[PDB]
Each structure stands twice: as C-alpha cells, then as structure tokens.
Amino acid sequence: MASPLDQAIGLLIGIFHKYSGKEGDKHTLSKKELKELIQKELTIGSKLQDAEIVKLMDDLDRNKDQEVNFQEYITFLGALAMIYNEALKG
Amino acid sequence: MASPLDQAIGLLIGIFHKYSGKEGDKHTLSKKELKELIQKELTIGSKLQDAEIVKLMDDLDRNKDQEVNFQEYITFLGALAMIYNEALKG
C-alpha cells in the first residue's frame, strides 16, 4: 500500500494515526489527541481562523466520549470540508 | 494539479456528485440518486459479489436528512474505507 493513489487516502490515515503515537497503539484518538488535533490542522489547515463556536460543533466526538474512530474523525472532516473545500454546493 | 491529495479530494467530490446527472441536487444528494451509489459504485462491493442484501443494512444514508449531505456520504464511506483501505487497525 501507500502507492500514490492509495497514499492519498494514506495521508488521511496518516493524520488520523499521527495522533496515536501518544496513544501507545494505533487505536481511537482518546480525548487528549482530539482536543490537541482540533486546535491545529483540522479546519483551514494550521491557520484555522474558524471560531470557537465552530470548534464547539466539531467537538462532536462528544457523541461517544471523545474516543474518536476513523469514521467519527471523517464525520467532522467531512462536514467541515463540505464548507472549507467548497466545490460541492456551488 | 490532480496530484495525489488534490486528485483524491477531486475523486471524493466527483463520486459524491456522480449521482447528480438526473435530479440529485448540488447542495445535498438525493436518496434516489444515492441508491445508485450503494448498489454499484460503492468501491468495495463489485470486487466480491456486492451482497446488496447486506448493504440494505449499511444504507445508513437513511440517518436523518433523507436527502443526505456530503457528511453522511463521506461518514459511511469513511467507515467502509476504515475496512477496505486497511492500514489503520492492522
């Protein structure tokens, strides 16, 4: 795996489990990881600009006590990307 | 310029709005268009024998909006990707 076309998804998997070094093993981003993540790259890259009140939405990991699975991670990334990456609604 | 990441984003959006050459809508994605996705173009399925009957479960696009957003789309595809793209639980 990690052949260019797959490697592209590999990047998303990358960011996901980048926040798993501090988790011992390649599991769910257990709380600290997510709250460390959301403030860094999540939204408009490592620039953010988006408000605390937006982050208060994507804290959505709340759904299942902040142990974020790839699905859960992808949920907010999806929601946000549908805005920030706009070539979807237009 | 259709390099790995940009190409992949392009593909995600492209698949989302593949089922938008009928009604479908641009802001959301219609049920009846999504029901094309699930049967054939679901990434995995066609490499086995689809097993449409099981997809009737993972037809979780049923969630809330009916005429789903990019969110529910990429959430459920994300869940599947966590399986088919296995380099993250393995």
Q: Given A70, A79, A81, which is nearest B82 (Cβ)?
A: A70
Rounded distance, CA B3 to CA A77, Å? 20
A88 and chain B in contact, CB less than 8 A: yes
Nearest to A72 by CA among A59, A55, A81, A54: A59
- List C-alpha distances in Å: B78 to A54, A75, B21: 22, 8, 24
Q: Is B50 exposed, middle or buried (0-12, 13-18, 19+ CB in 10 A)?
A: middle
Contact A61, A55 (CB under 8 A): no
* Residue A61 labeled ligand binder: yes
Q: How many domains does chain B have?
A: 1
Domain residue limits at B24? 1-90
Rounded distance, CA B45 to CA A79, Å? 25
Q: Given B13, B75, B81, which is nearest A88 (Cβ)?
A: B13
We report the CATH number of the domain holding residue A3 as 1.10.238.10
3-state secondary structure (DSSP) of residue B86: coil
Q: Distance, in angstroms, between B76 CA and closest chain A CA?
A: 7
